[PDB]
Every structure is written in structure tokens, then in C-alpha cells.
Amino acid sequence: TVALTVPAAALLPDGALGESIVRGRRYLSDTPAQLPDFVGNGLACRHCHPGRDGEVGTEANAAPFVGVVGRFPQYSARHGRLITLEQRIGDCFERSLNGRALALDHPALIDMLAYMSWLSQGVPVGAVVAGHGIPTLTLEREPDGVHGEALYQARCLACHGADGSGTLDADGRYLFPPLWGPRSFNTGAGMNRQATAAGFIKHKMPSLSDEEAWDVAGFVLTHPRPLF
Ligand code: HEC
Ligand code: HEC
């Protein structure tokens, strides 16, 4: 694998590409507000693909976009065939944002691609970046949702709410996003899988033990959310 690196915003090119990258960043950080026809819930891309310093998709083990463009096209078991990055983004619009895929030549889609290509600057095509994806966490026992409930109240609730509905910021965007219910991700999302949720929670919290991450993920995933 190659190391995860984040290019400097100060070195962005003047011109059409620079401008596109900037719009891309915004669509990824502010998605429900910038793309209302395509988003069906309260989530922005940055709520599962967080980043430091205004960027999006730059954190190891939280599915960073750094280096993503060199990994597509790739086989998708979901589709039964090779898919492009444009299509992969479409899947997260339909599942994670409970919405609709943008047309494959939609200029907002091309802006998001330009942003991801900028983040992938210097990464060799084909190379795998350290920290890519969300590494799964799997324990050899059932997730204990009773224990999980107690852990939720002690470690999560303060941010994500008793009802899992999250906390709105002053501008109507989620400061702390919703974890279940009608504004959360739908059942088709990868985050609706126990080992992916457990792994995401384990790595994004710093901190929880493996058993704790496993059990609280189980509790979160007992709740209703939109059907895909
Ligand atoms: C207690 C262990 C928990 C659990 C189970 C979760 N969280 Fe959070 N969370 C917070 C913020 C600002 C985000 C957006 C991403 C970021 O910038 O880091 C998240 C994201 C999540 C997700 C994915 C998004 C979703 O809506 O499903 C999940 C599954 C999740 N969290 C679970 C903020 C906080 C906190 C404020 C300091 C605290 C405490 C937690 N989260 C704790 C938990
Ligand atoms: C949590 C509810 C998510 C939101 C909101 C979005 N995405 Fe997502 N994405 C999510 C998971 C759990 C994964 C799988 C990670 C893995 O281990 O592979 C993804 C994956 C992507 C990818 C593929 C990344 C790769 O390395 O292959 C892309 C390009 C992607 N997601 C884009 C994306 C965009 C553009 C979003 C806002 C529209 C978005 N995602 C939201 C979980 C979530």
C-alpha cells in the first residue's frame, strides 16, 4: 500500500478545475442543501466520510476518498459486474442518502469527481492507500443489544440523541447526524451492516473496546430506518 496524504488547498489550480474542486467539496460537505432533488434524508457525504480542515474523505478507516479514483472501475457484487466511480457515488446517494443517483454526466457529479481526483493527486493508478475503506470489526458472539443500549446512553446519546435523531446546527445542517429513523441511512446502506457499523464506530471514536463497539452497533441497528 501507499501512504495516505492530503494535498494543500493553497496549491489548488486557478481555472475551471480549481473552481470545480471547490464546488465538489461543497457538494460533499453540504449535500442535502446543495442537492435537494437527490438526497432523501438528513445526511451529507461527510457524515460517514469525514475530513480535517474543511476537507471531506481524508480520514483513515472512515472510507477516505484519497486514492479512490485509481481503484475504479472495479467489480461490484451488488451489481454483478464492473462499475465506475460515478456509479459507486450513485449507490451512496440511493442507499446512504436514501435518495436518487445523479445522471452520470451531471455537473455536480463531475465536480465531486474532480474533488476526489484532487485528493488522489500523486497516488499511482491501481495502488491501494493505507486506511482505505472502513475495516470491518467482527466478534465471535452475538451483538448484545441490552449492553449496547447502556453503552449508547453513556457514550453516544449526548450527541446523537435519545431517539437517535441527532442534533441540528444553527444553519439547519446536522452537527451530529441521525443514526436511525426516517432521516438516517436506509437498509441498503453499508452502514446498515453489523460488522461495518462496528468497525466504523471502533475507529472513529478516538475510545471503545472491540466488545463495546460490537454491542453498541448492535443496539443502533435494532432500530427502524427507511426501507431500500
Ligand atoms: C457512541 C459510541 C456513538 C455511536 C454508536 C456513534 N457515534 Fe457519532 N458522529 C458524530 C459526528 C460529528 C459525526 C459525523 C462524522 C464525523 O465528522 O466524525 C458522527 C457520525 C456517526 C455515524 C455515521 C453517521 C450516521 O448518521 O449514521 C455513526 C454510525 C455514529 N456516529 C455512531 C458525533 C458523535 C459525538 C459528539 C462528540 C459522540 C459522543 C458520538 N458521535 C458517539 C457515537
Ligand atoms: C454512511 C451512512 C455513509 C454516507 C452518508 C455516505 N457514505 Fe459513501 N460509503 C459508506 C460506506 C460504509 C462505504 C464502504 C466503505 C468500504 O469499506 O469500502 C462507502 C463507500 C463509498 C465509496 C467507495 C470508497 C472506496 O474506497 O471504494 C465512494 C466513492 C463513496 N462512498 C461516496 C459517497 C458520496 C459521494 C457520499 C455523499 C453523496 C457518500 N458516499 C455518503 C458510507 C456512507
UniProtKB/Swiss-Prot annotation:
Binding locations of heme c 1: 45, 48-49
PTM annotation: Binds 2 heme c groups covalently per subunit.
Annotated source species: Allochromatium vinosum (strain ATCC 17899 / DSM 180 / NBRC 103801 / NCIMB 10441 / D)
Identification of the protein by name: Thiosulfate dehydrogenase
Enzyme class: oxidoreductase
pH dependence: Optimum pH is 4.2.
PROSITE patterns from the UniProt entry: CYTC (PS51007)
PANTHER family: BLL4482 PROTEIN-RELATED, CYTOCHROME C DOMAIN-CONTAINING PROTEIN
Gene that encodes the chain: tsdA
